[PDB]
Amino acid sequence: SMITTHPALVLLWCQILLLVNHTDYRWWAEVQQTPLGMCNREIVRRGALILFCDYVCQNLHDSEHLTWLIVNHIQDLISLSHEPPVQDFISAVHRNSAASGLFIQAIQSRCENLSTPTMLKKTLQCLEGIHLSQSGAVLTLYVDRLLCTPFRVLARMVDILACRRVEMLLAANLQSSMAQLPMEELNRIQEYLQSSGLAQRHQRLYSLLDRFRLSTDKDWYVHLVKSQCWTRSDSALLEGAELVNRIPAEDMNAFMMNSEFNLSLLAPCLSLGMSEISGGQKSALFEAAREVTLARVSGTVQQLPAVHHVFQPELPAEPAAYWSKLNDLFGDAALYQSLPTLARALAQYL
Amino acid sequence: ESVIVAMERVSVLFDRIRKGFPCEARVVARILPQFLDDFFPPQDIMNKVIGEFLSNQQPYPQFMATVVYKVFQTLHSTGQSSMVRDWVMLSLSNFTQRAPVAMATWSLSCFFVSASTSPWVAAILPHVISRMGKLEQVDVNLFCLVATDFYRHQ
Amino acid sequence: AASCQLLARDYTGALAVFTRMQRLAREHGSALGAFSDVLVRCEVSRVLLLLLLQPPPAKLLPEHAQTLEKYSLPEELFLLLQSLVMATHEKDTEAIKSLQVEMWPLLTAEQNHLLHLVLQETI
């Protein structure tokens, strides 16, 4: 009952209840909240986790506290990793095999919570050097979970840590490496690398991993512009426009009308049509992009509901079940991703 | 006497290609090949563009490669194309020394695809500058294909 | 003045006045106070103003070499902008498309204008 009006006296009482070895997991549970809040309760939770980690730092030969503290409070452990007592606790987990394996297991169970950039950078600084018998588990965690982030520096850091991990895997004994890392899991890692685009983005991991494995002209131009233009999405924008520019242009509506077409190239195609028309003689690129732009606009309004009702962003779902239709075909990421592409196209056209 | 002043001012234009933010380089690269074609005979601009296209003191040669493509395409009259082919021979003997090897084979593929024949070779040239570095086996395939297409040009 | 020259789209003038601001605040700043706020705004806008107009290494002053050495201030902003320098020098579009939606509330209006200008001149 003292926890809310004063935190600092309850932190003193936590250290007193630690200095005499009173460790009842019911009281530490009701303090540290085992699975908008207040501020004093947060100060007490952080202080209790810090002082408990220092208690396990002092007397570590009794090893139930390591398992319980790592399994239960894992996210709230790594969120505080820039304080000295939990830093000594972290360096103490780095000297055990089963505790570090349970630690990487606990990160694997709660990786979806470590999506913010700060908590992920603190896990990368917390998985920086671990026990050498656990290198296969952290490599599987690196290539499975922590490599698909949109942030590039965290991908670069986990790339450097994974390459140093395979480097430390190779320098050890081969019978130690083969007994921990199975071959079928290695083919799983390699098919996950070659499946996504991270194989050609990172040469070093695939090179070191295959090293560890081996230790144990007309239509051709049409195919080339089909390779360059017909993708999902790319940065080649003016380049794709100049590539479709020198098409024979008796067959354009055959090429533009495709189920898998970069509609993002339509606005650079219209810009090149504008440059050719305002320079000299007319182009076919402009009329082709005009035809397919207006046809796709007519198509995407044919998918709209017929009897339109006015938007109100104060009470949206109130008047009818029309918002079921304006969430079904409208919150889908495909049509929503296709709409402002056509808005760029119609912006250039108008 | 006006010819050496023209050489001096073309050198100042290339100096403003040397320094210069990429919008300014886009402008000078766009306005360059018409000026070089219209002002004076192409031997001087040929010497200048080879001597200032392969410099290691160069930020990026991509718009300069487009300049190379347009200045080769405006020199495709008949005796002018034989002079172009002799300049290709001289510049490939200049290409015999090795640059940094990925940019070397890239710029050599650009030089092959630019000074080339009519029907479908020129349209590949935006795709060749679509990657500046990033050497891949497909780039080796494109380079060997434009090489064997230039072997039947001679 | 920097906000004025960014309105009138003299971006190299804004780069010059931002490196002059960082030079003055470093020379008088030990950071001491509001000089920290000046350094935060100038360090975000000089990075965005270096990725907007990518200078050649001839005109590149050594201060810009220092910042692009640091990149190749609050923690989430430093991490996201360092990732944005990497995603732009990679020229990776979807990376920036998901980076702006996370970087919008952490920047002010004019810095968002500079970041939209960065995102436009890679697309």
XYZ file of C-alpha atoms in Angstrom:
627
model
C 0.000 0.000 0.000
C 3.081 2.238 0.224
C 4.026 1.597 -3.393
C 2.015 4.371 -5.011
C 2.551 7.505 -2.943
C 6.290 6.869 -2.438
C 8.461 4.739 -4.684
C 11.888 5.337 -3.165
C 11.078 3.961 0.273
C 9.643 0.860 -1.378
C 12.866 0.520 -3.362
C 14.779 0.694 -0.077
C 12.462 -1.977 1.293
C 13.098 -4.100 -1.802
C 16.840 -3.934 -1.175
C 16.281 -4.799 2.493
C 14.092 -7.744 1.500
C 16.915 -8.813 -0.816
C 19.805 -8.402 1.633
C 18.148 -10.849 3.939
C 17.362 -13.696 1.557
C 13.568 -13.326 1.476
C 12.598 -14.332 -2.057
C 8.882 -15.019 -2.270
C 7.827 -14.968 -5.906
C 4.328 -13.831 -4.876
C 5.570 -10.490 -3.538
C 8.080 -9.968 -6.344
C 5.274 -10.867 -8.735
C 2.872 -8.323 -7.248
C 5.622 -5.713 -7.397
C 7.076 -6.397 -10.865
C 3.701 -7.263 -12.506
C 4.246 -10.691 -14.047
C 1.783 -11.461 -16.907
C -2.402 4.271 -19.140
C -0.558 3.167 -16.030
C 0.822 5.290 -13.225
C 4.322 6.669 -12.824
C 5.286 5.540 -9.329
C 4.322 1.972 -10.188
C 6.659 2.151 -13.188
C 9.525 3.479 -11.063
C 8.964 0.643 -8.592
C 8.866 -1.952 -11.392
C 12.138 -0.745 -12.928
C 13.853 -0.480 -9.558
C 12.673 -3.914 -8.488
C 13.930 -5.523 -11.692
C 17.302 -3.760 -11.337
C 17.847 -4.730 -7.704
C 16.686 -8.294 -8.347
C 19.136 -8.586 -11.241
C 21.889 -7.396 -8.920
C 20.836 -10.021 -6.369
C 21.179 -12.743 -9.002
C 24.470 -11.083 -10.017
C 25.886 -11.527 -6.501
C 24.756 -15.085 -5.714
C 24.329 -16.914 -9.027
C 25.105 -20.512 -8.023
C 21.439 -20.909 -7.109
C 20.017 -20.992 -10.605
C 16.221 -20.951 -10.418
C 16.185 -17.145 -10.461
C 17.977 -17.039 -13.825
C 15.362 -19.238 -15.502
C 12.379 -17.498 -13.916
C 13.723 -13.971 -14.475
C 14.691 -14.677 -18.085
C 11.492 -16.517 -19.073
C 9.055 -14.134 -17.444
C 10.613 -10.649 -17.591
C 12.410 -10.668 -20.932
C 11.231 -7.548 -22.782
C 11.408 -5.453 -19.630
C 14.893 -6.892 -19.077
C 16.339 -5.714 -22.383
C 14.605 -2.336 -22.177
C 16.942 -1.346 -19.295
C 20.254 -2.695 -20.574
C 22.212 0.552 -20.053
C 22.404 0.291 -16.214
C 25.325 -1.398 -14.390
C 23.554 -4.154 -12.371
C 21.487 -5.541 -15.223
C 24.656 -5.218 -17.343
C 26.490 -7.489 -14.915
C 23.482 -9.816 -15.040
C 23.661 -9.832 -18.855
C 27.387 -10.595 -18.756
C 26.585 -13.375 -16.288
C 24.096 -14.973 -18.700
C 26.868 -14.855 -21.317
C 28.893 -17.355 -19.249
C 26.238 -20.101 -19.220
C 25.049 -22.426 -21.967
C 21.579 -23.428 -20.765
C 20.784 -19.919 -19.523
C 21.830 -18.359 -22.830
C 19.835 -20.961 -24.754
C 16.801 -20.199 -22.614
C 17.510 -16.498 -23.206
C 17.513 -16.844 -26.988
C 14.391 -19.015 -26.627
C 12.748 -16.210 -24.654
C 13.658 -13.687 -27.343
C 12.227 -16.116 -29.917
C 8.946 -16.302 -28.012
C 8.712 -12.512 -27.669
C 10.325 -11.164 -30.844
C 7.112 -9.554 -32.143
C 7.208 -7.124 -29.202
C 10.764 -6.086 -30.127
C 9.614 -4.177 -33.189
C 10.523 -0.666 -32.040
C 13.992 0.408 -33.216
C 15.322 1.120 -29.713
C 14.412 -2.236 -28.178
C 15.755 -4.017 -31.247
C 19.044 -2.104 -31.109
C 19.300 -2.989 -27.437
C 18.725 -6.674 -28.215
C 21.466 -6.453 -30.848
C 23.762 -4.898 -28.268
C 22.561 -7.562 -25.830
C 23.117 -10.478 -28.232
C 26.556 -9.061 -29.042
C 28.692 -11.813 -27.552
C 27.126 -15.004 -26.200
C 28.265 -18.476 -25.157
C 29.915 -20.362 -28.009
C 27.724 -23.466 -27.694
C 24.653 -21.391 -28.524
C 25.826 -19.984 -31.872
C 23.431 -22.033 -33.990
C 20.378 -20.776 -32.109
C 21.400 -17.132 -32.468
C 22.197 -17.690 -36.160
C 18.727 -19.133 -36.700
C 17.287 -16.157 -34.832
C 19.368 -13.737 -36.933
C 18.361 -15.223 -40.290
C 14.751 -15.959 -39.332
C 13.591 -12.922 -37.368
C 15.998 -10.010 -37.059
C 17.040 -9.705 -40.718
C 13.643 -8.760 -42.188
C 13.407 -5.380 -40.495
C 12.686 -2.342 -42.692
C 15.380 -0.362 -40.835
C 18.662 -0.604 -42.706
C 21.171 0.018 -39.909
C 19.671 -2.748 -37.814
C 19.946 -5.040 -40.829
C 23.562 -3.906 -41.254
C 24.350 -4.528 -37.587
C 22.700 -7.962 -37.560
C 24.595 -8.704 -40.784
C 27.905 -7.866 -39.100
C 26.951 -9.899 -36.026
C 25.908 -12.879 -38.170
C 29.133 -12.777 -40.195
C 31.190 -12.597 -37.003
C 29.012 -15.439 -35.692
C 29.806 -17.700 -38.643
C 33.469 -16.626 -38.357
C 33.463 -17.732 -34.711
C 31.629 -20.909 -35.760
C 34.349 -21.795 -38.275
C 37.296 -21.223 -35.934
C 35.969 -23.766 -33.414
C 36.023 -27.545 -33.763
C 34.106 -29.109 -36.633
C 32.620 -31.854 -34.443
C 31.289 -29.146 -32.137
C 29.814 -27.234 -35.089
C 28.166 -30.219 -36.783
C 26.635 -31.586 -33.566
C 24.836 -28.298 -32.851
C 23.878 -27.150 -36.353
C 21.939 -29.781 -38.338
C 22.126 -29.978 -42.109
C 18.373 -29.816 -42.801
C 18.150 -26.619 -40.747
C 21.057 -25.299 -42.826
C 19.104 -25.998 -46.028
C 16.142 -24.273 -44.360
C 18.321 -21.205 -43.699
C 19.622 -21.275 -47.274
C 16.155 -21.582 -48.831
C 14.960 -18.733 -46.608
C 17.887 -16.652 -47.857
C 17.368 -17.522 -51.528
C 13.593 -17.137 -51.193
C 13.635 -13.493 -50.105
C 15.850 -10.802 -51.593
C 18.367 -10.841 -48.740
C 20.601 -13.305 -50.595
C 21.895 -10.758 -53.109
C 21.696 -7.885 -50.613
C 24.186 -9.666 -48.336
C 27.037 -11.472 -50.053
C 29.039 -12.224 -46.920
C 26.546 -14.406 -45.044
C 25.788 -16.556 -48.074
C 29.498 -16.838 -48.930
C 30.511 -17.845 -45.393
C 27.552 -20.208 -45.084
C 28.365 -21.994 -48.348
C 31.968 -22.108 -47.113
C 30.765 -23.839 -43.937
C 28.707 -26.207 -46.096
C 31.646 -27.050 -48.382
C 33.953 -27.578 -45.396
C 31.745 -30.534 -44.445
C 17.723 -9.499 -81.460
C 14.066 -8.457 -81.671
C 12.108 -10.706 -79.300
C 15.073 -10.863 -76.922
C 14.647 -7.117 -76.399
C 10.971 -7.786 -75.661
C 12.045 -10.337 -73.051
C 14.516 -7.837 -71.583
C 11.892 -5.112 -71.215
C 9.562 -7.729 -69.766
C 12.307 -8.477 -67.243
C 12.798 -4.801 -66.421
C 9.238 -3.461 -66.561
C 7.039 -6.369 -65.456
C 8.166 -6.559 -61.830
C 6.410 -5.900 -58.545
C 8.092 -2.593 -57.682
C 11.468 -0.990 -58.326
C 13.502 2.222 -58.415
C 14.008 2.071 -62.194
C 11.559 4.753 -63.270
C 12.983 6.937 -66.043
C 14.984 3.907 -67.165
C 11.877 1.778 -67.592
C 10.280 4.692 -69.435
C 13.146 4.871 -71.922
C 13.054 1.083 -72.214
C 9.376 1.047 -73.193
C 10.093 4.149 -75.325
C 11.844 2.205 -78.095
C 9.176 -0.477 -78.438
C 7.966 -0.902 -82.098
C 4.674 0.717 -80.951
C 2.334 -1.269 -83.158
C 1.898 -3.498 -80.091
C 1.610 -1.275 -77.017
C -1.883 -2.105 -75.735
C -0.782 -5.735 -75.843
C 2.114 -4.876 -73.529
C 0.489 -2.348 -71.192
C -2.606 -4.507 -70.605
C -0.991 -7.075 -68.331
C -2.020 -8.572 -65.012
C 1.478 -7.956 -63.627
C 2.434 -4.464 -64.767
C 4.339 -1.677 -63.067
C 1.622 0.956 -63.162
C 4.111 3.272 -61.428
C 5.885 3.592 -64.788
C 2.778 5.229 -66.283
C 3.568 8.729 -65.037
C 7.181 8.664 -66.377
C 5.786 7.266 -69.630
C 3.400 10.220 -69.759
C 6.268 12.619 -69.025
C 8.280 11.159 -71.907
C 5.215 11.435 -74.145
C 4.936 15.099 -73.137
C 8.615 15.694 -73.940
C 8.313 14.015 -77.357
C 5.088 15.848 -78.235
C 6.269 19.292 -77.103
C 9.569 18.694 -78.868
C 8.305 17.519 -82.238
C 6.171 14.809 -83.819
C 3.676 12.901 -81.639
C 4.472 9.705 -79.742
C 2.704 6.405 -79.212
C 3.882 6.195 -75.588
C 1.600 9.077 -74.648
C -1.527 7.692 -76.321
C -0.810 4.212 -74.949
C -0.447 5.488 -71.384
C -3.529 7.699 -71.855
C -5.651 4.755 -73.022
C -4.553 2.443 -70.232
C -4.768 5.177 -67.574
C -8.353 6.049 -68.451
C -9.281 2.375 -68.860
C -7.873 1.496 -65.442
C -9.620 4.506 -63.887
C -12.907 3.296 -65.392
C -12.156 -0.173 -64.040
C -11.401 0.985 -60.510
C -14.535 3.101 -60.413
C -16.559 0.151 -61.713
C -15.497 -1.600 -58.493
C -16.864 1.277 -56.398
C -20.382 1.034 -54.923
C -23.170 2.371 -57.101
C -25.362 4.488 -54.811
C -22.773 6.722 -53.185
C -23.252 8.230 -49.740
C -21.239 11.118 -48.372
C -18.181 10.549 -46.188
C -18.260 11.794 -42.598
C -15.055 11.256 -40.558
C -16.744 11.993 -37.216
C -19.300 9.146 -37.230
C -18.256 6.731 -40.017
C -19.940 3.385 -39.242
C -23.203 5.003 -38.099
C -25.671 5.438 -41.024
C -25.689 2.083 -42.856
C -23.853 -1.133 -43.712
C -22.416 0.611 -46.782
C -19.187 0.978 -44.804
C -18.876 -2.808 -44.922
C -18.447 -2.378 -48.677
C -16.200 0.642 -48.080
C -13.977 -1.477 -45.847
C -14.031 -4.717 -47.866
C -12.890 -3.595 -51.333
C -11.358 -0.426 -49.904
C -9.107 -1.374 -46.991
C -7.499 -4.143 -49.024
C -3.837 -3.291 -49.530
C -3.861 -4.220 -53.233
C -6.542 -1.765 -54.396
C -5.417 0.834 -51.856
C -1.870 0.448 -53.146
C -3.130 0.751 -56.715
C -5.146 3.951 -56.193
C -2.485 6.684 -55.632
C -0.406 5.197 -58.428
C -3.308 6.038 -60.716
C -3.564 9.376 -58.905
C 0.021 10.164 -59.936
C -0.909 9.056 -63.461
C -4.001 11.264 -63.601
C -2.006 14.126 -62.055
C 0.423 13.973 -64.964
C -2.483 13.612 -67.398
C -4.423 16.587 -66.076
C 42.751 32.020 -82.780
C 39.083 31.546 -81.890
C 39.545 27.757 -81.953
C 41.749 27.709 -78.849
C 39.233 29.991 -77.091
C 36.539 27.458 -78.000
C 38.757 24.731 -76.524
C 39.215 26.791 -73.342
C 35.483 27.335 -72.906
C 34.677 23.675 -73.625
C 37.237 22.880 -70.913
C 35.388 25.239 -68.535
C 32.164 23.397 -69.430
C 33.800 20.074 -68.569
C 35.123 21.721 -65.390
C 31.522 22.535 -64.495
C 30.766 18.876 -65.093
C 33.650 17.993 -62.694
C 32.244 19.964 -59.801
C 28.532 20.582 -59.655
C 25.366 19.281 -58.055
C 23.410 16.664 -60.067
C 20.729 19.022 -61.409
C 23.468 21.238 -62.862
C 25.151 18.171 -64.333
C 21.823 17.098 -65.854
C 21.557 20.489 -67.566
C 25.114 20.505 -68.934
C 24.735 16.889 -70.079
C 21.495 17.701 -71.904
C 22.783 20.830 -73.639
C 26.205 19.388 -74.444
C 25.908 17.059 -77.515
C 23.990 19.505 -79.708
C 26.568 22.206 -78.915
C 29.499 19.878 -79.600
C 27.920 18.653 -82.839
C 27.025 22.117 -84.104
C 30.073 24.179 -83.160
C 33.263 22.584 -84.500
C 34.402 19.310 -86.239
C 34.136 16.174 -84.104
C 37.809 15.177 -83.725
C 38.390 17.710 -80.941
C 35.249 16.739 -79.008
C 36.169 13.082 -79.559
C 39.602 13.598 -77.990
C 38.033 15.618 -75.166
C 35.270 13.144 -74.337
C 37.646 10.178 -74.249
C 40.225 12.143 -72.249
C 37.590 13.349 -69.769
C 35.268 10.325 -69.690
C 37.707 7.771 -68.229
C 39.159 10.063 -65.562
C 39.320 8.739 -62.018
C 38.776 12.383 -61.073
C 35.127 12.126 -62.109
C 32.104 11.875 -59.768
C 29.787 9.818 -62.008
C 30.009 8.986 -65.706
C 26.387 8.045 -66.321
C 25.132 11.302 -67.806
C 28.542 11.563 -69.450
C 27.838 8.148 -70.961
C 24.553 9.527 -72.296
C 26.635 12.376 -73.750
C 28.856 9.709 -75.365
C 25.775 7.956 -76.786
C 24.353 11.118 -78.318
C 27.685 12.324 -79.718
C 28.169 8.920 -81.328
C 24.637 8.914 -82.717
C 25.071 12.349 -84.286
C 28.211 11.031 -86.026
C 26.506 8.208 -87.948
C 27.001 9.439 -91.476
C 29.016 7.044 -93.621
C 32.602 8.368 -93.697
C 31.874 9.808 -90.277
C 30.939 6.284 -89.121
C 34.241 4.924 -90.436
C 35.981 7.718 -88.502
C 33.829 6.695 -85.516
C 35.033 3.092 -85.884
C 38.670 4.232 -86.012
C 37.985 6.243 -82.855
C 36.485 3.101 -81.289
C 39.738 1.294 -82.136
C 41.852 4.072 -80.585
C 39.648 4.297 -77.496
C 39.599 0.517 -77.004
C 43.386 0.551 -77.097
C 42.959 3.231 -74.434
C 40.553 0.813 -72.684
C 43.280 -1.852 -72.528
C 44.545 -0.397 -69.251
C 42.348 -1.535 -66.389
C 40.128 0.746 -64.305
C 38.382 -0.512 -61.150
C 37.128 -3.654 -62.736
C 33.355 -3.459 -62.208
C 33.171 0.145 -63.409
C 35.687 -0.841 -66.106
C 33.512 -3.546 -67.656
C 30.441 -1.353 -67.114
C 31.880 1.651 -68.963
C 33.278 -0.652 -71.636
C 29.803 -2.105 -72.149
C 28.409 1.441 -72.397
C 31.057 2.331 -74.978
C 30.255 -0.809 -76.963
C 26.498 -0.294 -76.875
C 26.684 3.417 -77.723
C 28.896 3.385 -80.822
C 27.068 0.528 -82.507
C 24.624 -0.376 -85.263
C 20.997 0.573 -85.902
C 18.169 -1.839 -85.107
C 18.000 -2.958 -81.462
C 21.369 -2.358 -79.834
C 20.827 1.317 -78.893
C 17.598 0.733 -76.956
C 19.452 -1.462 -74.453
C 21.566 1.531 -73.408
C 19.198 2.917 -70.700
C 19.267 -0.549 -69.129
C 23.068 -0.626 -69.159
C 23.197 2.618 -67.190
C 20.320 1.413 -65.019
C 23.006 -0.307 -62.951
C 26.243 1.655 -62.592
C 28.075 -0.893 -60.474
C 26.700 -4.264 -59.286
C 28.550 -6.661 -61.553
C 26.552 -9.822 -62.154
C 26.722 -12.759 -64.567
C 23.835 -11.211 -66.517
C 26.013 -8.124 -66.980
C 28.755 -10.418 -68.289
C 26.191 -11.918 -70.683
C 25.139 -8.474 -71.924
C 28.773 -7.382 -72.272
C 29.752 -10.504 -74.215
C 26.684 -10.135 -76.434
C 27.423 -6.511 -77.298
C 31.064 -7.535 -77.825
C 30.201 -10.255 -80.345
C 27.712 -7.903 -81.995
C 30.499 -5.363 -82.412
C 32.822 -8.076 -83.743
C 30.524 -8.473 -86.761
C 30.425 -4.681 -87.131
C 34.073 -4.469 -88.227
C 16.994 32.826 -42.419
C 17.444 29.143 -43.179
C 13.686 28.675 -43.178
C 13.417 31.625 -45.584
C 16.020 30.250 -48.001
C 14.323 26.877 -47.803
C 11.083 28.611 -48.733
C 12.696 30.322 -51.734
C 14.363 27.003 -52.677
C 17.964 28.157 -52.467
C 18.948 24.836 -50.935
C 22.705 25.359 -51.203
C 22.221 28.634 -49.385
C 20.424 26.707 -46.657
C 23.345 24.273 -46.557
C 25.810 27.141 -46.193
C 23.808 28.816 -43.438
C 23.313 25.506 -41.630
C 27.011 24.702 -41.585
C 27.621 28.274 -40.416
C 25.093 27.719 -37.618
C 26.771 24.486 -36.537
C 30.168 26.201 -36.652
C 28.961 29.079 -34.452
C 27.154 26.886 -31.943
C 30.145 24.560 -31.651
C 32.431 27.551 -31.130
C 30.201 28.995 -28.391
C 28.514 25.878 -27.016
C 30.575 24.348 -24.199
C 25.994 21.386 -25.450
C 25.329 24.318 -23.112
C 21.594 24.822 -23.384
C 19.465 25.958 -26.316
C 22.619 25.297 -28.350
C 21.579 21.639 -28.013
C 18.263 22.458 -29.705
C 20.163 24.275 -32.457
C 22.460 21.265 -32.919
C 19.508 18.875 -33.077
C 17.670 20.885 -35.746
C 20.828 21.557 -37.735
C 21.926 17.924 -37.603
C 18.593 16.666 -38.881
C 18.315 19.283 -41.604
C 21.946 19.053 -42.733
C 21.592 15.296 -43.206
C 18.365 15.747 -45.140
C 19.970 18.595 -47.082
C 22.943 16.408 -47.933
C 20.732 13.588 -49.166
C 18.604 16.024 -51.163
C 21.474 17.456 -53.203
C 24.176 14.800 -53.244
C 27.433 16.727 -53.567
C 30.511 15.607 -55.474
C 33.633 14.842 -53.407
C 35.340 17.947 -54.855
C 32.941 20.550 -53.434
C 32.302 18.421 -50.325
C 33.619 20.352 -47.347
C 35.276 18.223 -44.614
C 32.409 18.959 -42.196
C 30.067 17.129 -44.558
C 32.623 14.324 -44.637
C 32.395 14.211 -40.836
C 28.594 13.953 -40.830
C 28.451 11.362 -43.609
C 31.152 9.417 -41.772
C 29.008 9.579 -38.637
C 25.976 8.387 -40.607
C 27.366 5.741 -42.965
C 19.865 14.054 -30.610
C 17.135 11.611 -29.568
C 17.762 7.943 -30.087
C 14.843 6.998 -32.356
C 15.583 9.938 -34.631
C 19.302 9.129 -34.849
C 18.556 5.482 -35.579
C 15.901 6.186 -38.198
C 17.968 8.853 -39.946
C 21.048 6.640 -39.959
C 18.918 3.897 -41.486
C 17.596 6.451 -43.962
C 21.103 7.434 -45.058
C 21.803 3.742 -45.601
C 18.520 3.174 -47.456
C 19.171 6.145 -49.726
C 22.794 5.241 -50.473
C 21.408 1.785 -51.238
C 18.558 3.437 -53.220
C 15.900 1.150 -51.708
C 12.398 2.540 -52.261
C 10.138 0.468 -49.980
C 12.599 1.044 -47.144
C 12.035 4.799 -47.398
C 8.289 4.321 -47.960
C 8.027 2.541 -44.628
C 10.591 4.835 -43.001
C 8.670 8.075 -43.506
C 5.442 6.804 -41.887
C 7.513 6.146 -38.748
C 9.551 9.368 -39.118
C 6.646 11.806 -39.574
C 5.825 12.693 -35.913
C 9.463 12.922 -34.899
C 10.148 15.838 -37.286
C 8.658 19.299 -37.644
C 6.972 20.703 -40.741
C 9.932 22.090 -42.708
C 12.051 19.034 -41.979
C 9.175 16.957 -43.314
C 9.293 19.136 -46.431
C 12.978 18.327 -46.788
C 12.327 14.629 -46.244
C 9.573 14.605 -48.857
C 12.019 16.305 -51.225
C 14.500 13.525 -50.419
C 11.878 10.877 -51.137
C 10.892 12.546 -54.403
C 14.421 12.791 -55.795
C 14.983 9.069 -55.336
C 11.684 8.334 -57.087
